[PDB]
Amino acid sequence: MKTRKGIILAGGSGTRLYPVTMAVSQQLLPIYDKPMIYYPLSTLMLAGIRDILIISTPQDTPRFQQLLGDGSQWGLNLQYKVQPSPDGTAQAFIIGEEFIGHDDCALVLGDNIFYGHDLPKLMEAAVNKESGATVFAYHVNDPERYGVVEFDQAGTAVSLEEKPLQPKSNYAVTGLYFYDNSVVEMAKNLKPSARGELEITDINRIYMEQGRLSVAMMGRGYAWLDTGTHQSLIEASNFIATIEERQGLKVSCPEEIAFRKNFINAQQVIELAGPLSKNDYGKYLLKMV
Amino acid sequence: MKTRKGIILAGGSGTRLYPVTMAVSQQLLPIYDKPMIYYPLSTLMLAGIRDILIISTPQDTPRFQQLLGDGSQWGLNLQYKVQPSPDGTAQAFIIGEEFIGHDDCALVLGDNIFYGHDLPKLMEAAVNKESGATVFAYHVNDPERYGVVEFDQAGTAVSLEEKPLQPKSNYAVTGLYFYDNSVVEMAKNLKPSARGELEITDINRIYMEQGRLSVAMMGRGYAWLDTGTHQSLIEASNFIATIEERQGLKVSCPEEIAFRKNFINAQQVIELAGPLSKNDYGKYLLKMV
Amino acid sequence: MKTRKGIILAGGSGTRLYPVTMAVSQQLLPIYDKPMIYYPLSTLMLAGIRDILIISTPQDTPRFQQLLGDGSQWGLNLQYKVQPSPDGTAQAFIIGEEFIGHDDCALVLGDNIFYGHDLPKLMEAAVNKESGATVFAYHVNDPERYGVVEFDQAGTAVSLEEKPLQPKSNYAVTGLYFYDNSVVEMAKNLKPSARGELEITDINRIYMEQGRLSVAMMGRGYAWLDTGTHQSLIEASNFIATIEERQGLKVSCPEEIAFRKNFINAQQVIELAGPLSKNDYGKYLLKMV
Amino acid sequence: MKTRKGIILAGGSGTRLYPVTMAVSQQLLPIYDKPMIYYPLSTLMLAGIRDILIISTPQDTPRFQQLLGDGSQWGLNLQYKVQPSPDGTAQAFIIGEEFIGHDDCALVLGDNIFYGHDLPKLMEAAVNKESGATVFAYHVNDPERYGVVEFDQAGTAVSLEEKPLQPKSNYAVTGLYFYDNSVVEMAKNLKPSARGELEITDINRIYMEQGRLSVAMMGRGYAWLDTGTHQSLIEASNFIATIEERQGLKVSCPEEIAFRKNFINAQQVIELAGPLSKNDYGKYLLKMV
Numbered sequence A, B, C, D: 001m002k003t004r005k006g007i008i009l010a011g012g013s014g015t016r017l018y019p020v021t022m023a024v025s026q027q028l029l030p031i032y033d034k035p036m037i038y039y040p041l042s043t044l045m046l047a048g049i050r051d052i053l054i055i056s057t058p059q060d061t062p063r064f065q066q067l068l069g070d071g072s073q074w075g076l077n078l079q080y081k082v083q084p085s086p087d088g089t090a091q092a093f094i095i096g097e098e099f100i101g102h103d104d105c106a107l108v109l110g111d112n113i114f115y116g117h118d119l120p121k122l123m124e125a126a127v128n129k130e131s132g133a134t135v136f137a138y139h140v141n142d143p144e145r146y147g148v149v150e151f152d153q154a155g156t157a158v159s160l161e162e163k164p165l166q167p168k169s170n171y172a173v174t175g176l177y178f179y180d181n182s183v184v185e186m187a188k189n190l191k192p193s194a195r196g197e198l199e200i201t202d203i204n205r206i207y208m209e210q211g212r213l214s215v216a217m218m219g220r221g222y223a224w225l226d227t228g229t230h231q232s233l234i235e236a237s238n239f240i241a242t243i244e245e246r247q248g249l250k251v252s253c254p255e256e257i258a259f260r261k262n263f264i265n266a267q268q269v270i271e272l273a274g275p276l277s278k279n280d281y282g283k284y285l286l287k288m289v
């Protein structure tokens, strides 16, 4: 079963970014030339995933709904569900249980930006996996802040620890995950962690203890950025800016990926571009077709 | 009469930043570690202006309201009014006619960021002017995009042109203006320009024609940035970031300015800083007191 | 024959960066934490090319020499030759005629920075080509500034134009080229272009006309930057900085690449890293081993 | 006696920037669009100082000499003297003793960038002081790395400590200093510090113990940047870039300051611009006149 459903966890508190995130959701913040949520959404789209459930806070869910709509304009089927309280990323599978049904589902954090040659290829391997789960390991400078994966001599993943005091490696689990349908039952039975939250890491550990976790390496050639701090938020923006300025191509443009993957055709693009042709984004879409 | 009233024009369509401004108000977009509106707000605070009316769109006006409230926490008196449609910047004085009354009133654009040694001294001079109006002239690289002020050989402001195809100089009129009570009567009788908008420049031309306009020069030693383009918004953030990182001091932090100007006491600061201590912002205010 | 020889063209007038290039060679300018030449040098190292000739101006050639020496510390064999005057990039093969001999030879511009997942795999394919030549096509925002490659409806490279007034496409030819021995004979018989310079593009057109040119596409997933302008040089540095900061890994560090490719052992690394431990650079290599 | 002599200490080791500073002096590195040394030189020029002694290493002194010449082109009188070994900034007065004679002299570190409205004014006060010394205090985030100044209740400087473990404040002494002629005798008798170097800080302490030190406050409105680390070097570049891009005015352009201060007239500017008009710097100079 190809993973055809996905979830974007665009809620949270964003205390690290106050007061910036006091009146503006972290996932609505701009990462250079477009709202942050366009990045994780693009990643799902590039995986061939069109049916997406967007989860956010009670106050912000309607805003992402106003920004994205039902997604038909990009040939997508977007749905929205509120997460009452930020009680853990794993809760996404409890909230989106109905949305998932008996199918497989991907989950990507709303503030995660993925960029790199052959990124679609790497995900497709996970999209096609008949069962189990697929997570990605990425070398970072401060692994303690993330879910760290320990590898043995042969280079095989053996354990996972959420924000360990002493990381057993510098490889963090990224915020993009692909699960089979058994994820829902795991989430429903998960107990609050040591930090009072239902962590996705605990789900990844269950898949691993059952020998069903594939820890796909995401090399240094790829870019995996986070936007939880003032510093990182601006670093990611400069990053994307350098790339787009040089290439004359936008990174993660929903309209462009929709067109290139045939979710919509040229006429639709032209119709969308027209009313926006007055600005650069519109001109970008027109040049594309 | 010392100017004690100010108006922050925080609306507009903001079509140039599309799509970042599709889900979040431009004046709420972050400039490194704080909402864009904190900057022009700080400018008025530094000018001694505490009674401030915030005008935004019908959709966003309530958002600024939820973010800032009546402003009493910073020893300010904030009021809010909606601008049905972006009919023009000069329309701010018609909308705020009741708020202004018979008093003098300053106007600052919600996306204007001012910074430089003696800035307070600069505004102070314009704030104490008995009558007339005061605008500032800043040397910019792209004059065509703003109100341009031409000078005669003696170096005296002789004319003002809104977005001239052939700028008569590289000095633009910034978005910080100090007017006397007569400004209300002018805006009320203003006729829409060729572009169907009530131009603030027209107001300024009227003051000039009446020999009541002081065009204060704002030297290159000062920094004046607006966020018209994605590229400019990110440079604005890098600018503020380098400064703050280096000095270990924040730029345009309302809580700090309210405190250093004795608008509020150390106890009020500690209370407002409590929820914001998850990051440097709140810890900063704590150390400040 | 596996391409084992490479030439790094590190000269030129560099008049566009004036005055930064008035006292220091452009290829010695820093890109965040290391000299610009370390990047193209790393590209050749990653392509398996260890015998490298560095061509620069009569003034700078000796400077690269003092910086890198014979390159044996990185398990390389570096040679140096002077380019009297910047008569053209294709002149590299006349100057390096003795160095090349009867072998194949790669050419990379001293100011070219390549980065991306599978980059080594990309070059590997061109390095193992029996005969012919291999260049790469990259989508850029300003094609007019480089050799442009046009494609027919079937998507096949049909022509090459040096700095066309009317680019036939947005794909530029990067400064990394893989040629067979016949390149020497071509450059020797090349006549200066309209701008009085021996164009590398002419060489490439000759390979195309002989049906021996492979135009490999270099996707948007890859990053290709040159330092033609002050603005580009700084974006290049921010790009590398964000990446290194995030991964806790360095981009194009010769010592590291020489080590991971077994060009040198851990003992050689420790020795070269000793003097460089006053900053992250040397400490990095230490932790690496 | 108006301070009419100055010294630029453009030597040092720059170990923190290896290998960037292995073949390129730190003061030759680019700070966006021009070599680092243009900044401290500009500061001296803005102080009305034309007779300047440039001190550097034995290998780099001739390079600054090749970049600047005798300075007659900018209406200056530049001299050069080598500092055999980086034995301390205070040694600058031993090396330049002959250059100083019986006159007053300013000293600015070669990697110090000063920017801010009314910066010339602040220096002129020090330039006119009949005797004693003038140093500047600046609020920084990491004072331990600099010479820290302690102030009492009234806000009067009382002590100075070079790189104290526990700074008595967050105010660092900048790298710009103005001394009367007694500085030479102090330097000749200075004993190596606790770190085996003749520190300028010890000279500042002697002036203070004699009640002849003026610690001029340099507020947050000013920008004082250092370029000793990879991070700071790029932060300063982005800073200057944002300013120049917005204003269309260059920060610290020797040719421009020379013209504006009448060291040279328009004809000279035109003659200098002509041969450089092909690049942006030349066009900048032409637009200026």
Ligand SMILES: Cc1cn([C@H]2C[C@H](O)[C@@H](COP(=O)(O)OP(=O)(O)OP(=O)(O)O)O2)c(=O)[nH]c1=O
Residues within 6 Å of the ligand: A009, A010, A011, A012, A013, A014, A015, A016, A017, A026, A055, A056, A083, A085, A086, A087, A088, A089, A091, A109, A110, A111, A112, A228
């Ligand atoms: C936990 C948790 C996170 N998030 C999503 C939001 C984020 O994009 C992503 C990770 O952000 P996180 O930074 O780990 O949580 P946060 O957004 O509240 O930031 P802070 O720690 O400063 O308070 O996960 C939720 O939507 N719901 C949750 O219950």
Ligand SMILES: Cc1cn([C@H]2C[C@H](O)[C@@H](COP(=O)(O)OP(=O)(O)OP(=O)(O)O)O2)c(=O)[nH]c1=O
Residues within 6 Å of the ligand: A218, A219, A220, A221, A222, C042, C046, C114, C115, C116, C117, C118, C119, C120, C121, C250, C251, C252, C253, C256, C257, C260
């Ligand atoms: C290995 C290695 C690669 N590179 C750069 C070259 C390429 O542009 C980019 C990616 O090439 P690759 O390394 O092969 O891509 P990767 O994602 O597989 O990296 P890894 O599995 O080792 O984490 O990394 C270096 O600069 N230094 C190195 O030591």
Ligand SMILES: Cc1cn([C@H]2C[C@H](O)[C@@H](COP(=O)(O)OP(=O)(O)OP(=O)(O)O)O2)c(=O)[nH]c1=O
Residues within 6 Å of the ligand: B009, B010, B011, B012, B013, B014, B015, B016, B017, B027, B055, B056, B083, B085, B086, B087, B088, B089, B091, B109, B110, B111, B112, B228
């Ligand atoms: C016109 C107009 C502008 N603005 C404020 C919004 C901005 O902060 C400030 C800047 O002037 P403008 O730049 O013209 O504001 P804008 O958003 O209309 O420009 P654009 O759509 O091209 O991006 O003026 C209003 O609030 N109301 C108005 O009627």
Ligand SMILES: Cc1cn([C@H]2C[C@H](O)[C@@H](COP(=O)(O)OP(=O)(O)OP(=O)(O)O)O2)c(=O)[nH]c1=O
Residues within 6 Å of the ligand: B218, B219, B220, B221, B222, D042, D046, D114, D115, D116, D117, D118, D119, D120, D121, D250, D251, D252, D253, D256, D257, D260
């Ligand atoms: C004039 C002039 C100033 N400066 C920098 C030095 C100071 O840090 C900063 C401000 O000092 P001043 O220039 O004298 O202050 P200003 O902003 O009033 O100058 P102006 O009226 O010409 O706009 O400008 C230059 O770099 N080049 C110049 O040609």
Ligand SMILES: Cc1cn([C@H]2C[C@H](O)[C@@H](COP(=O)(O)OP(=O)(O)OP(=O)(O)O)O2)c(=O)[nH]c1=O
Residues within 6 Å of the ligand: C009, C010, C011, C012, C013, C014, C015, C016, C017, C027, C055, C056, C083, C085, C086, C087, C088, C089, C091, C109, C110, C111, C112, C228
């Ligand atoms: C032409 C020519 C270029 N170059 C190398 C230098 C650069 O790294 C690379 C880039 O191509 P160019 O950009 O044309 O090099 P350039 O320095 O002549 O360009 P400009 O003066 O406008 O800044 O080519 C030479 O070494 N020798 C040459 O004869």
Ligand SMILES: Cc1cn([C@H]2C[C@H](O)[C@@H](COP(=O)(O)OP(=O)(O)OP(=O)(O)O)O2)c(=O)[nH]c1=O
Residues within 6 Å of the ligand: A042, A046, A114, A115, A116, A117, A118, A119, A120, A121, A250, A251, A252, A253, A256, A257, A260, C218, C219, C220, C221, C222
């Ligand atoms: C195509 C396409 C890719 N991507 C980003 C996603 C990946 O991180 C990165 C590279 O994945 P891929 O695009 O599939 O690798 P590529 O460089 O070969 O693509 P192309 O041949 O079209 O140049 O590009 C977009 O954001 N938008 C797009 O329209």
Ligand SMILES: Cc1cn([C@H]2C[C@H](O)[C@@H](COP(=O)(O)OP(=O)(O)OP(=O)(O)O)O2)c(=O)[nH]c1=O
Residues within 6 Å of the ligand: D009, D010, D011, D012, D013, D014, D015, D016, D017, D026, D055, D056, D083, D085, D086, D087, D088, D089, D091, D109, D110, D111, D112, D228
């Ligand atoms: C000490 C000392 C510094 N310097 C000048 C060079 C610098 O611009 C300035 C301060 O730089 P410093 O950073 O304090 O010394 P440095 O340039 O050797 O850098 P590092 O500590 O990483 O080795 O003083 C000298 O020229 N001679 C000296 O004897």
Ligand SMILES: Cc1cn([C@H]2C[C@H](O)[C@@H](COP(=O)(O)OP(=O)(O)OP(=O)(O)O)O2)c(=O)[nH]c1=O
Residues within 6 Å of the ligand: B042, B046, B114, B115, B116, B117, B118, B119, B120, B121, B250, B251, B252, B253, B256, B257, B260, D218, D219, D220, D221, D222
């Ligand atoms: C004080 C104070 C100033 N400012 C900004 C406003 C001005 O653009 C800039 C400089 O105004 P001024 O503060 O008066 O300039 P200054 O160099 O004298 O600062 P100080 O003596 O306090 O160190 O600082 C703030 O943002 N917050 C503050 O709390």
